[PDB]
Amino acid sequence: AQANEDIVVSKTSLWKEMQYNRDITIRFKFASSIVK
Amino acid sequence: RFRFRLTVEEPSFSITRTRVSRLYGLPAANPNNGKEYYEVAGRFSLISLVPSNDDYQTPITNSVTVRQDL
Amino acid sequence: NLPITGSMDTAYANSTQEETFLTSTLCLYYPTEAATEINDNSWKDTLSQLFLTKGWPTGSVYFKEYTDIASFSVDPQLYCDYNVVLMKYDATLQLDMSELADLILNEWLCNPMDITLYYYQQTDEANKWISMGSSCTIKVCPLNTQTLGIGCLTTDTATFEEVATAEKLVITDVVDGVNHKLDVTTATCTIRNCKKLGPRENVAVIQVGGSDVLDITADPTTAPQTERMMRINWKKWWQVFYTVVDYVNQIIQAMSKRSRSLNSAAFYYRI
Amino acid sequence: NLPITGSMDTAYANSTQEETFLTSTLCLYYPTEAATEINDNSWKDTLSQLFLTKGWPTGSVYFKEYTDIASFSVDPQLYCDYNVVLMKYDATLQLDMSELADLILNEWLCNPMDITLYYYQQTDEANKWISMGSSCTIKVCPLNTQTLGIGCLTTDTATFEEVATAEKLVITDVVDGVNHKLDVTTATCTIRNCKKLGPRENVAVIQVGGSDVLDITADPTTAPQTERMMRINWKKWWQVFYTVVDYVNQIIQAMSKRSRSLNSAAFYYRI
Lengths: 36, 70, 271, 271
Ligand SMILES: *[C@@H]1O[C@H](CO)[C@@H](O)[C@H](O)[C@H]1NC(C)=O
Ligand SMILES: *[C@@H]1O[C@H](CO)[C@@H](O)[C@H](O)[C@H]1NC(C)=O
Ligand SMILES: [Ca+2]
Ligand SMILES: [Ca+2]
Ligand SMILES: [Ca+2]
Ligand SMILES: [Ca+2]
Ligand SMILES: [Ca+2]
Ligand SMILES: [Ca+2]
Ligand SMILES: [Ca+2]
Ligand SMILES: [Ca+2]
Hints:
Strand content of chain C: 25-35%
Binding site for Ca(2+) 1 (chains C, D): 40, 151, 159, 161
Protein name (chain B): Outer capsid protein VP5*
Protein name (chains C, D): Outer capsid glycoprotein VP7
Strand content of chain A: over 45%
Organism (chain B): Rotavirus A (strain RVA/Monkey/United States/RRV/1975/G3P5B[3]) (RV-A)
Number of strands of chain C: 13
Structural class of chain A: mainly beta
Strand order of the largest sheet of chain C: 2-1-3-11-12
Subcellular location (chain B): Virion
Largest sheet of chain C: 5 strands, parallel
Number of strands of chain A: 2
Bound molecules: 2-acetamido-2-deoxy-beta-D-glucopyranose, calcium ion
Number of helices of chain C: 7
Largest sheet of chain A: 2 strands, antiparallel
Shape of chain A: elongated
Largest interface: A-B, 24 and 24 residues
Distance between the termini of chain A: 55 Å
Oligomer: part of a larger assembly
């Protein structure tokens, strides 16, 4: 297994099911609205 | 979309030189506290129904002209 | 390897003890406190001469010193054709000494474990994770089919399950067939995925004092004491070395040549 | 050593080169200037990877560095199963090159000499006096049948005849059957009475640049130039090492296992 695998759980001619497992670094921020 | 519940910590927001203090929560005045970002480590596992060929592309960019009345 | 057919009527050959003593080397590993208590700069030469009285050629017996069990356990390098480790007993280190024995009384086929990129599992009972270094703090987080964690969060190392802290050597055994996220101090520790192939015949461990506490098998139902695990009560280190010298033939009889074809990089002291 | 009877129709076995590389090891000896010119902190690693492409498993090839021929000549220890010594050619050090090649390309049986107490003589052509150390200065006073010096005075060491001065290694060959009084700087160099048993088939010497000047036999009438004494032209050391790696098959082909049993326990690498 891996921290960033790309597994296949089903596949057809035009479509497939991809199981993505990934580690992420979510960097978010706040926005303040000021009305005076 | 990651959803977060909230638990107020020891620091208390208050307006100095004003009659408001000892109030718990997080105001909208300066939530970032001068930080360029808040960083949280996550991991996600999901199963997505995707076209078999890894060459298709859903549109990503946009040209937005909404709220013309506004 | 080929079949070997032998007749039960074949005559015994003469004693080969003298020939093997003449054509082999002996390595003795002792703690530094032994040298401290002995307090003599020529004791190596004296023991060499006594071994010569026993039969070993001058210079075939090599004396190696280690600070303690914990320090010795960091990638021990056994050189001679026959290795004897005088291991001091401590009631607080019963596991550690056992671990050391489990590392030097058995052959191990090891490969690297780059845990930052892969999640690892133990396929069978022979598979273990041997971690060695100055400080080995190993935390484990068993994962599920979606690789997320059971009773643990892959991201938060705090919630991980603690299996080792501040260790020079640790043998980790987790439940087989389950993928685990591993958090180890890679700066001061190297962890290897290892399979035990079998006993290592050229290494004997003499426990100086204490009782029988060694358990070189992770299985709780077995605590087998092989002939290579000796135990002697002691009060002076000179007596310990004298009994090692006098019964050297008995000690070597309990040992055999390594017989394994290796692929690793370790020096040896051979004649 | 029993007679071996063989039939001239026995089928050839397959190539043992692959298994030999998997079960043997190669020590490559180079001068300091080689690493100085290469100017890389991982040239050993890339050379090992290239050797692996050539067949040798990782950790099998060892790289040993020596300051120069003179320094390397002081008791050289050869560890690996196969040894290749890259010896740079200096037109002013032909005899030193020959002495080093004689020492490491041949097998010697040596015993200590007490030049202070007893006189010494060389029994036959295979008998020499090899003196090595930080600085070897050897003077010789041949004696007559009445143990009186010839052209020299036993009491006065100034009248002695100088055969070595400040050498780090020198092979002294005096007239056989004559007893000599030896004046040697025993405080800085040791002289040993040695006999040449035969060739060391696991040591090849590659002479980098120059001409064929090596002479590993004291006989004036022979300059063998055996198959284990190669010579190459060079301008850059990287090309030299690439040539060594690419043709390691031929180099090992020119060498055979040592095959000599040693009564001395020394440090070696053996996989
Ligand atoms: C074995 O021991 C016997 C009894 O001392 C002796 O006669 C014989 O020569 C020895 N060697 C062999 C090879 O049998
Ligand atoms: C030897 O080489 C032959 C021909 O290349 C091959 O068929 C055979 O398997 C090899 N090994 C043995 C043990 O014959
Ligand atoms: Ca431990
Ligand atoms: Ca937990
Ligand atoms: Ca297990
Ligand atoms: Ca057990
Ligand atoms: Ca010289
Ligand atoms: Ca003279
Ligand atoms: Ca001579
Ligand atoms: Ca010659």
